[PDB]
């Protein structure tokens, strides 16, 4: 699709068989979703957002479609306001910004 | 252009006067820039992310150059970690993610 940019970018992703909404976010560096139970370990990661730091719960290789898209990737959990779909899964279903 | 997202999207930006760099940032509802001096009114403001929240001071009709592209709009002036060119710019700019 193109997707122009008047309202919130919001499409649905699917993580472990769950359907939730996310923001498609060109500036962040990761993918940050609300609190939710994800398999394996995890390891810790501070991001930086325009209020400050915050700690998440780093999961790797984490099945997740978005806009029916599949990726698998780089999931971080954490207090994010909303969840977003940052650039390592953008590149995954090979988005990019056009002007 | 097209613009992949194998890096973060920063481009130049020209704004009071002064050239800056910028992240075009399909996350951000407003364009939050750093510290600076603009001419005219404006409100105080806060606006939230990851981290929560900070105070900006909102000036409206500014106007920026994007990569080269004229754009008219409001322009937040706080203590935000990066400079971003928010989708009420943007859109001005005819910019889309497309996938
Ligand atoms: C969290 C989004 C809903 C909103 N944000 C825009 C978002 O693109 C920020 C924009 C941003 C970018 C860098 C630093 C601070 C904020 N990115 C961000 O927090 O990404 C974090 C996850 O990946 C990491 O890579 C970037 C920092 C980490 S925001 O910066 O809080 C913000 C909120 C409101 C306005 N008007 C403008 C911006
Ligand atoms: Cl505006
Ligand atoms: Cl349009
Ligand atoms: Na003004």
């Known amino acids: 699709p193109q997707i122009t940019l008047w309202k919130r970018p919001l499409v649905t992703?699917?993580?472990?068989?769950q359907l939730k909404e996310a923001l498609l976010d060109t500036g962040a560096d990761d993918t940050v979703i609300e609190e939710?139970?994800?398999?394996?370990?995890?390891?810790?990661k501070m991001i930086g957002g325009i209020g400050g730091f915050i700690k998440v719960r780093q999961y790797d290789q984490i099945i997740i479609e978005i806009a029916g898209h599949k990726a698998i990737g780089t999931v971080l959990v954490g207090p994010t306001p909303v969840n977003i779909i940052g650039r390592n899964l953008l590149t995954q279903i090979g988005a990019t910004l056009n002007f």
Do not use: H, N
């Open 36 to 44: 939710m139970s994800l398999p394996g370990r995890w390891k810790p």
């Open 13 to 17: 992703i699917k993580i472990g068989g």
